[PDB]
Design a protein around this ligand. Sequence first.
Ligand SMILES: [Mg+2]
Ligand SMILES: [Mg+2]
Ligand SMILES: [Mg+2]
Ligand SMILES: [Mg+2]
Ligand SMILES: [Mg+2]
Ligand SMILES: [Mg+2]
Ligand SMILES: [Mg+2]
Ligand SMILES: [Mg+2]
Lengths: 384, 384, 384, 384
Amino acid sequence: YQPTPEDRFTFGLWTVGWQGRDPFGDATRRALDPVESVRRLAELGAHGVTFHDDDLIPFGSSDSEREEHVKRFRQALDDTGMKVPMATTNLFTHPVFKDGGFTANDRDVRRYALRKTIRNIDLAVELGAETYVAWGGREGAESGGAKDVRDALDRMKEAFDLLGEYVTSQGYDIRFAIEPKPNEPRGDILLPTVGHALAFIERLERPELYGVNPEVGHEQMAGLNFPHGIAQALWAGKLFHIDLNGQNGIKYDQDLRFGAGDLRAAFWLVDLLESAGYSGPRHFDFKPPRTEDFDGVWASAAGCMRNYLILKERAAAFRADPEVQEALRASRLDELARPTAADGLQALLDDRSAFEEFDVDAAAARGMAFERLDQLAMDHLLGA
Amino acid sequence: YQPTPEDRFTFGLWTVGWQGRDPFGDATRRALDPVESVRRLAELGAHGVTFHDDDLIPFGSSDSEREEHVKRFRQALDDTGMKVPMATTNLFTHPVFKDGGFTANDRDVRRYALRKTIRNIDLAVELGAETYVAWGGREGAESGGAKDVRDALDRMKEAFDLLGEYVTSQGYDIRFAIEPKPNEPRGDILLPTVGHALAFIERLERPELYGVNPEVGHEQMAGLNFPHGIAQALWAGKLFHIDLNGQNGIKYDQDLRFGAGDLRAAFWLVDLLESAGYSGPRHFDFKPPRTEDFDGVWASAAGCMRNYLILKERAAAFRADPEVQEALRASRLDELARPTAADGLQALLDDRSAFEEFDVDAAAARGMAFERLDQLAMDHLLGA
Amino acid sequence: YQPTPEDRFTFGLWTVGWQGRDPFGDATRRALDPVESVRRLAELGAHGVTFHDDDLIPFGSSDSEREEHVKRFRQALDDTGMKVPMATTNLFTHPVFKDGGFTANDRDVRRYALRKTIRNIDLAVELGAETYVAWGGREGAESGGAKDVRDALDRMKEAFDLLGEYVTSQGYDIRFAIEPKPNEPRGDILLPTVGHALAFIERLERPELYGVNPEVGHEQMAGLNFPHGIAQALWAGKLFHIDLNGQNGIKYDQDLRFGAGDLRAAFWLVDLLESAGYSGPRHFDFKPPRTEDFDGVWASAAGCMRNYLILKERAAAFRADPEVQEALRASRLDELARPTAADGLQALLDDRSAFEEFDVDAAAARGMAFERLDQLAMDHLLGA
Amino acid sequence: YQPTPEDRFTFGLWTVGWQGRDPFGDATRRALDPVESVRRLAELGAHGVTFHDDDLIPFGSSDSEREEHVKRFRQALDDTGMKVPMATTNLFTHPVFKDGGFTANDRDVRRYALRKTIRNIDLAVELGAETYVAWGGREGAESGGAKDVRDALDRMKEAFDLLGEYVTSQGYDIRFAIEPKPNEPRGDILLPTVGHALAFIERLERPELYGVNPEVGHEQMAGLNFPHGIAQALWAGKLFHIDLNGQNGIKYDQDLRFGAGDLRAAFWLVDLLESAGYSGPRHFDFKPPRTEDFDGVWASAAGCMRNYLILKERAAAFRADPEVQEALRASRLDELARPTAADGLQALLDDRSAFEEFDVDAAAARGMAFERLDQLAMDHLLGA
Ligand SMILES: [Mg+2]
Ligand SMILES: [Mg+2]
Ligand SMILES: [Mg+2]
Ligand SMILES: [Mg+2]
Ligand SMILES: [Mg+2]
Ligand SMILES: [Mg+2]
Ligand SMILES: [Mg+2]
Ligand SMILES: [Mg+2]
């Protein structure tokens, strides 16, 4: 279980470098240097990093302070063989975003929110990122009257339209991925589930430009099955990226290491990507708990990497045992892949074995046999 | 607060006629006669009824028992002046649906599930219903391996495709409305929120044929703001129907009377339909609690009707007070309706007042003034 | 609805003075002066203030800086006629409390946590507070192995034992009130509900010294009926204090103004204190949302005060209408106050009308008539 | 992983014999014979059974039909070597309990509720049960006005007082265990958590007579850590029984097999009983999902038994590795067992190393090292 760069594991600068400041208390570690965060991840076995625009360059820095920061960061990229596959904008930390960016009430703020996104699109294309993740963390409200949603759904689309026009005119070969979250920091946020995000995308002037970035924890916060959100996304060709962490149920976004929270969910999820052929970057968006020092930090992401490598093993072993392969056929998982009525509407309607001569009592007695399967994946997951 | 038939209030046969049998205990009232449920609602002030196909005719009845039941029910419709605007299929109560209908694993069941839907489409068109609500109550799973979702999203669409072909060929002038629910009876169900349902619809061969039937309680079960789900639906032209009840948070579907559960949510919701021009049937899908007798029953739906008539009054009064109308302008609710960049991408990008000469500290200090508004709707809602 | 000081309304220095810094973003208002927070509340109609020990005096201040701060604050108390009925310790903001105070793993921290509590007990007795609220905000864990609970329940009791010994020896005439919260900032916290807190209290060497400080929002976070927690407390003589705010369900502690969140819950709660004779300080522990300026601030607490004064009116009107008073008797609310078996075990057991000659079908048909009552309190709450 | 009768595993007649009837649909299996449920469990390796009083004898049976049923059941007990360690009363299924038993409003019902409990106490003492579990499933309300809680807390205690007097006078050597649940079937139920139940117990005239029966699923429904509820119970000497199943979060009581739902919670729980010396009956209160036939049934409880036997192995292996034993000492789990101030209040207060000469910055930098531990139990749980 030593991760290789060919696993394409990415981490974020913000995730290992989180200083442990929480809504109630102060930061228990000092600020890292992005140079030192790059070298270190290449000595654990990771494959790339990802950053918001305030990560790499501090807010308000002068254009010569900007490039020096970019030159250092680049030199590190050239000193580790590590890439930057995804990049993103910080639209949430400055008090001028307190009511959002793209959906902020005030008109003058929305324009600035757009200009600060485009300026980081040019940086991420230069550092070669193939994905561009957008999380409206401040879009939504705390009170039913504060945000008229239909207008707020009108200004979102606008800005994401403009983002699609900026990239077409420039010749940039990059795609957007919206990241949803139902609440926190806002009491409600717009486009809450992965499903809501798919709905909004189909209404943009160029639907082939935008996917979704889902997160394990963000969907489990609404009590929602994640490997089930991850199938709908693959089913409409819209899994562009995915965020790997752990979460213990409906509550504040804990952002635990991947492996924690719900382990059977992390199992069935790794099963689904490997067997459906997801070739994107396994990104960990998480938070090493604030109790730990720096030694607890680097042990934490080694976990992320090491837990995925174990389930992928138990996932493949589950799918290679000919006792499971029979167990699948006894629940009739194969008929679920065959068409219901390939013979056509008229044949169906003419078929008397489907209604008038159908034995509803002999069908209803057939046992689905789901509980001996679920234990064979229980056996395969615990290795007993 | 006497409801008039011009309010278009509908109830369901199943809702007043619920016998009070719960997952743990037995039925505390005896079965009603659909004739007696029709006369009675016309003496409270309601405008129509709605039914599943097992409501009006018992399951398995012979075709002469079917028409006699239809003839009685019709004679009542002719003896009250009441209509049937929406109708729906019972795909959940018989044990042959234990794993669903349209998404049931077995192939022979899915065909039957389709045939039992079409046969009730012909009844509802004869009784003149304009809407046809579909609630996959048994679609979903309890275990991560039991339902491959991408296949299950393939067989849904199929059947809803076939339903759209059956209605086009026949000349029927009716539309479908999917009704979502995140769980119960199944531990998870497919297409959980109103947003998921909008996503699935755009992928059917005829997108102008299907809307959503939302329910207050079904979305509040996932901790989701309902007057916010009700705006996204209006914003894509897909509010075909709506179900009115009450619910106290994330838990088993209580199905309380409209007015209970969350009253401010019921306030902001009635505000939104009246000010956006919803002309559909105000349907109450609810359950008079099983403790009550028949006298408690008829008092219960009188509540439903009487609580909507009060909020519509407090909603209009809130929107007519020129102190509110000023209060809206002080939060800048008017600029939220104006475009962000009608002058065009190039102008925005050339405008130095939007970035380089923008005063971020003087904007961030402007107070949104949300809390004096929210009390004026507090004042308007309690009438003090 | 002008609040009078005889309403005994208290606010906290920390609540109006919250600077709007959240887990994701920066503070949108500047720091208040406790002098200016005192004068202002006396011009709205409030009756007292309450403070943590880091509020009034900054952490680490020298003993001459301490008394000057106390002298200023006192002079204000003498310049408004306002009292300080409750006081409390800040055990959560400094990084030396990251794992708790009384339950912190390390031994040297626990002693310091005790010394910093006693030193503020002497201040609050000097400023005359009658209650001393204790919220272990940092007690609990994020991981099943980090905190052995039985030991952690052993060190709590210890420190609360020592607190009871310090006050008995000194002659102080003050009582403690534990404040529970199920999670946040910690993912789980110890003694989560009001019920857990009552359980822990009975095990201290002096049970007549400790009550509970409950909070509306803290119990609604676990999906729990608050006017029902507020009855169990009164029923064992342990409602020493209560915190008034609002909360929209299970999620991060919003701390909305009293009146928001759940209004029917705030109704039935004000009903319960007024009709049971609670004579304690109506304290508002809340957070004016960070979008507002200072003008939005002072409007916010005026709400708190003004919403309580409205429900107390609708609560009394509900309890004075002889149609309600009959409505209570028809549900048999009076027999619920009579004893089940005052005649004694032997009589009960000899009574053949209670078993062998009991008509179970004629009892089960009697209607509890709950839904016509609930609308009369609906009518009384909306005033229609 | 073959369970032996010396594991003391009990099942309930009602759990394997659940017919699969749910709040929305009909029963997918036929009724078992309690004789056939007894023989079968003795061929899987279980140690006893448990029953409600309507299980073994149908409601209303004549006293000769009662004893014949008891004689058959007994003959089976004599034909398997299996015991009946716990028994319980069905106070929830008949419509005369729709508003509760002990807390039912009506006076005549409460007396009957008491008489039907005592009559089953005499049966369970004859069949030799050592525990007597009581679940007020119908105690609570759906509406804030329907149940005055303080009175309702007065009639509970009464009946549980009377139950304690009936057993003292008779010479019965048996103890009660209250079983809590926050909601369902009622929207709220009284004494919701394990903590609330401990609080109610200390107020009965004979506190050494009543413990708590906790259930994994019942506490996880309120989002509450179960191995943490299971420590508070052991810490006050009040773990008399425990119910083993699985549950996926806050929602309707799924009652999955032990092993499902939250596996790390089931891990840390088996860890806690084995290392604290719980000698009671490992009872499975669960529901084989209704999709299965009878073959899926018996595979299901074999799981329950087989999953506990695996964690007890991984739990012991985790606690025997001297790399863990060092890992415990590095988080300072040993100082958490030492007293904070065994030297006494006066010494603490005189100790200048605990306040005035205390290095708060060198303590706050010490890393708790929680994340390398949690992975060693991750390694020990997955066996990698
Ligand atoms: Mg995150
Ligand atoms: Mg994320
Ligand atoms: Mg319903
Ligand atoms: Mg509905
Ligand atoms: Mg608070
Ligand atoms: Mg508080
Ligand atoms: Mg159960
Ligand atoms: Mg149970």
